[PDB]
Amino acid sequence: LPDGRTAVVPSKLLEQAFNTTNTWLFKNAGDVEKRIIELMTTDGMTQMREDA
Amino acid sequence: DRAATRDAITKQISAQQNQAAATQKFDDMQAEVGQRGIVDQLRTLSAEGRAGEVNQILEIRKELTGVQDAIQNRQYRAAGEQRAQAAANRAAEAHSLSMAAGFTREQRDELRRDRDEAKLVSGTIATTFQDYDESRQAQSEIMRIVGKEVGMPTDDQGMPDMSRASQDQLDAFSNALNEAGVQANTSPTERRNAVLKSLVDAGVSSKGIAQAKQEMELRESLEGLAPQDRTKVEATIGAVNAELDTLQRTATEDYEREVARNPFVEPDKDPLGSVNKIVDKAVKSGFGWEGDRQDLNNMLVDFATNGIKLPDGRTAVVPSKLLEQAFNTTNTWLFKNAGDVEKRIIELMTTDGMTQMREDAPTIRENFLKTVSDIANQKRSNAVKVTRSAEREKG
Amino acid sequence: DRAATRDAITKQISAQQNQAAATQKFDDMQAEVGQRGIVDQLRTLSAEGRAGEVNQILEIRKELTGVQDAIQNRQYRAAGEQRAQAAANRAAEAHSLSMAAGFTREQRDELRRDRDEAKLVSGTIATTFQDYDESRQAQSEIMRIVGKEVGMPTDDQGMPDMSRASQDQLDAFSNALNEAGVQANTSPTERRNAVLKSLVDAGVSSKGIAQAKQEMELRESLEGLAPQDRTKVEATIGAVNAELDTLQRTATEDYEREVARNPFVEPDKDPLGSVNKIVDKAVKSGFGWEGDRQDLNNMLVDFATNGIKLPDGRTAVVPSKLLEQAFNTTNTWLFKNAGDVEKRIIELMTTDGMTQMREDAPTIRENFLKTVSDIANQKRSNAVKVTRSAEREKG
Amino acid sequence: EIRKELTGVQDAIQNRQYRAAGEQRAQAAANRAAEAHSLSMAAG
Numbered sequence: 001l002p003d004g005r006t007a008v009v010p011s012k013l014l015e016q017a018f019n020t021t022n023t024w025l026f027k028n029a030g031d032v033e034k035r036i037i038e039l040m041t042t043d044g045m046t047q048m049r050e051d052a
Numbered sequence: 053d054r055a056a057t058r059d060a061i062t063k064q065i066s067a068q069q070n071q072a073a074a075t076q077k078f079d080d081m082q083a084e085v086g087q088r089g090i091v092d093q094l095r096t097l098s099a100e101g102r103a104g105e106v107n108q109i110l111e112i113r114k115e116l117t118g119v120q121d122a123i124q125n126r127q128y129r130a131a132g133e134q135r136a137q138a139a140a141n142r143a144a145e146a147h148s149l150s151m152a153a154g155f156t157r158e159q160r161d162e163l164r165r166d167r168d169e170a171k172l173v174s175g176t177i178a179t180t181f182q183d184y185d186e187s188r189q190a191q192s193e194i195m196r197i198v199g200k201e202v203g204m205p206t207d208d209q210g211m212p213d214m215s216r217a218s219q220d221q222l223d224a225f226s227n228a229l230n231e232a233g234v235q236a237n238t239s240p241t242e243r244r245n246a247v248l249k250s251l252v253d254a255g256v257s258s259k260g261i262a263q264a265k266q267e268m269e270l271r272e273s274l275e276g277l278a279p280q281d282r283t284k285v286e287a288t289i290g291a292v293n294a295e296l297d298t299l300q301r302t303a304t305e306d307y308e309r310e311v312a313r314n315p316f317v318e319p320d321k322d323p324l325g326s327v328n329k330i331v332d333k334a335v336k337s338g339f340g341w342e343g344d345r346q347d348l349n350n351m352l353v354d355f356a357t358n359g360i361k362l363p364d365g366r367t368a369v370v371p372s373k374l375l376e377q378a379f380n381t382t383n384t385w386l387f388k389n390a391g392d393v394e395k396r397i398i399e400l401m402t403t404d405g406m407t408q409m410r411e412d413a414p415t416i417r418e419n420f421l422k423t424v425s426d427i428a429n430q431k432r433s434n435a436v437k438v439t440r441s442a443e444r445e446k447g
Numbered sequence: 448d449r450a451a452t453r454d455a456i457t458k459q460i461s462a463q464q465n466q467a468a469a470t471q472k473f474d475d476m477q478a479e480v481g482q483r484g485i486v487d488q489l490r491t492l493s494a495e496g497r498a499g500e501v502n503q504i505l506e507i508r509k510e511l512t513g514v515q516d517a518i519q520n521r522q523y524r525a526a527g528e529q530r531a532q533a534a535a536n537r538a539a540e541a542h543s544l545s546m547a548a549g550f551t552r553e554q555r556d557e558l559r560r561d562r563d564e565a566k567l568v569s570g571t572i573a574t575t576f577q578d579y580d581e582s583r584q585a586q587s588e589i590m591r592i593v594g595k596e597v598g599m600p601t602d603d604q605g606m607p608d609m610s611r612a613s614q615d616q617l618d619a620f621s622n623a624l625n626e627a628g629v630q631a632n633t634s635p636t637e638r639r640n641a642v643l644k645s646l647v648d649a650g651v652s653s654k655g656i657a658q659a660k661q662e663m664e665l666r667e668s669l670e671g672l673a674p675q676d677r678t679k680v681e682a683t684i685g686a687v688n689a690e691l692d693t694l695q696r697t698a699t700e701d702y703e704r705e706v707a708r709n710p711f712v713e714p715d716k717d718p719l720g721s722v723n724k725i726v727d728k729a730v731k732s733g734f735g736w737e738g739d740r741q742d743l744n745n746m747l748v749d750f751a752t753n754g755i756k757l758p759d760g761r762t763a764v765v766p767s768k769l770l771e772q773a774f775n776t777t778n779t780w781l782f783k784n785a786g787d788v789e790k791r792i793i794e795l796m797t798t799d800g801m802t803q804m805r806e807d808a809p810t811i812r813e814n815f816l817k818t819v820s821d822i823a824n825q826k827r828s829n830a831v832k833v834t835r836s837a838e839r840e841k842g
Numbered sequence: 843e844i845r846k847e848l849t850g851v852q853d854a855i856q857n858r859q860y861r862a863a864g865e866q867r868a869q870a871a872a873n874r875a876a877e878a879h880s881l882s883m884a885a886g
Contacts, residue, residue, distance in 0.1 A: 208845055210850060
């Protein structure tokens with residue numbers, strides 16, 4: 001995580017991150033890791049993370 | 053899914069979580085996890101319905117006719133009340149959707165807020181009573197065991213009879229309480245203040261607090277009554293609320309018929325998937341869009357999602373059957389391009405009668421909501437007055 | 448569909464909405480939504496029919512013959528009245544259609560207006576009584592419960608017996624009323640004034656207001672009677688109205704036979720689709736229009752829609768069988784062009800006997816309407832006189 | 843009399859079973875929550 005921590009990504013969040021409208025956007029490893037990084041940094045998702 | 057940012061969400065969202073909790077608790081209680089009582093249906097939707105279910109748990113032609121008449125009256129009243137509540141909920145949802153054109157609270161969401169506060173109060177109170185009942189039964193086990201040990205006049209329920217228990221009979225219970233148990237059972241006060249705090253946690257207007265206090269006084273009075281006296285009181289309440297119930301039901305049929313007449317008062321998400329078939333009618337031996345079936349579908353779902361730009365300066369969502377009758381002309385060759393069909397629907401939605409019906413729909417919707425709110429308020433008011441008068445007269 | 452502009456529509460249209468509301472309310476009540484009473488048919492079309500249905504709800508050869516005779520007389524009278532009403536409605540519609548040649552009210556629509564006002568009054572009064580009955584039963588539940596609690600002589604209905612209830616017996620009810628309930632039941636006044644206001648909202652001539660007031664007095668007197676006394680009074684009313692009923696029914700058969708003789712007194716929209724088959728008779732081995740089947744169909748439907756231009760200066764719609772007998776000649780070669788056939792139908796409609804029959808039709812139609820109106824007025828007048836005399840004599 | 847004990851035994855059984863089931867389900871849920879909390883804290 002960019003804050004300086006390490007959090008394990010859950011399952012359905014991962015699969016919904018992968019499942020886009022067209023898979024051609026996500027090809028390389030760097031692109032998909034950037035996608036999951038930016039999705040885990042969602043404000044509501046973050047708040048839920050420190051709420052757990 | 054919804055990706056909006058909650059941010060402050062001071063109101064209508066904490067209440068949303070609380071009502072979600074109330075609904076899931078009600079569902080869990082209705083599921084009857086494990087083995088419990090409730091031989092009959094035991095819907096427990098309202099006090100009158102719960103009393104009817106309790107009666108269901110409990111010359112010859114006299115009782116044969118009386119039981120049937122009581123069952124018919126209770127069932128009719130409960131069915132009318134629940135149908136009215138469902139219709140009012142649907143009307144309120146439609147009114148909120150109509151007002152949501154353009155967190156934009158206004159009077160529509162003010163009415164929504166007060167109705168949701170009433171629903172939260174009712175659900176929380178029902179959950180508290182249901183939770184208390186299990187403890188009451190568990191402690192009644194020991195009250196019955198002790199009463200059998202010392203020996204008091206008892207019936208099928210096992211607890212000593214109130215009328216037959218003299219002071220000397222209750223002396224055995226007093227000695228047992230002095231011995232062990234230490235069951236204060238002071239909850240009939242602490243309970244409601246706790247609920248108040250929860251309401252304070254949720255955030256409730258003064259009217260909701262007054263409604264909760266009235267529900268406390270009436271519920272505690274009902275719990276204090278003997279079963280026969282409780283049935284008498286609840287049936288008198290039903291009788292004094294019969295005229296309000298009749299007015300409410302009649303208003304409900306009138307307004308639901310008006311809804312059946314007017315699509316603008318009640319939209320539907322189903323026709324969003326229906327429009328595609330109309331697209332087919334533009335292709336089969338018909339001159340329509342120049343190979344723009346996808347474009348037609350996109351523009352139609354946009355029109356059914358956001359609405360057309362009315363020339364007055366507003367945006368109204370076109371209903372389904374008006375749309376299909378606009379499309380269905382004598383010869384489809386007249387309507388080919390997107391501009392022509394949008395001009396057609398624009399000029400058809402501007403019909404004088406159609407326009408009048410359009411601004412009539414919200415007025416009748418809010419009138420229905422106000423009428424049902426007033427009916428509920430008057431029902432609660434006459435109920436509280438009758439119950440407090442009866443309690444004062446008894447003691 | 449109708450695309451006419453309503454604009455002011457001060458009269459006959461607000462009444463139209465009110466009668467539509469009355470009809471839909473009657474249909475909803477007849478549908479019997481949910482579970483209710485009405486073990487028998489319970490048509491409740493009129494006071495006499497409703498009393499007969501109530502009786503249906505309720506030496507040996509004596510009663511065996513009497514019950515059968517009562518049923519036969521009631522059924523015959525009700526069937527005659529309803530058939531007469533339906534025939535009069537059809538005749539009034541035909542008269543309005545005939546007068547609509549050329550919002551053009553005149554005497555025909557004046558008669559239509561007063562008849563519609565009477566119908567509105569009857570429907571509104573029936574709806575009000577039906578709405579009141581449910582509240583009466585709901586409150587009678589508690590009256591019976593209280594009476595059983597204190598203990599009065601009671602029968603299958605559960606309410607204490609009026610004749611057997613002494614002053615001391617009614618003292619228990621008085622004490623119960625002083626205790627709780629607060630059921631004023633003052634409606635027997637407020638009710639009718641409310642109805643009056645609704646009539647004032649609808650717009651009613653003074654005659655309709657007088658009819659409504661008479662219906663109030665007679666209905667309240669009937670409600671005040673005991674069931675046996677009520678049956679006696681309604682049967683005496685039927686007896687005193689028997690001669691009026693016989694005159695009405697006989698007039699109805701006479702006038703409906705005259706209608707069966709005369710097409711001009713009663714048109715029909717069905718032959719508008721029939722004329723096409725006659726077109727076929729102009730083609731099968733016959734010299735007719737020179738390939739103008741569509742033109743012939745258009746001109747025939749125009750003639751059956753607007754009528755032919757009579758030489759006197761008027762326009763009359765040609766009926767069906769006269770048209771087909773005009774077309775059916777010994778040899779179809781005589782009638783080929785449109786001008787020849789229109790000249791043929793023009794000269795045939797100008798027949799002396801046919802003409803006399805034409806101006807006879809409206810006269811007999813209006814005579815039938817006037818006779819049924821007078822019969823209804825006399826029935827109501829003798830009913831109100833007998834009821835008020837009986838009420839004065841009883842007390 | 844006979845219905846007295848018939849109702850009492852059933853009520854006692856129902857109350858005891860409900861209480862025991864609630865307690866054991868609560869204990870299992872708490873154990874799972876504690877294991878999850880330990881796993882979450884074991885980061886690093």
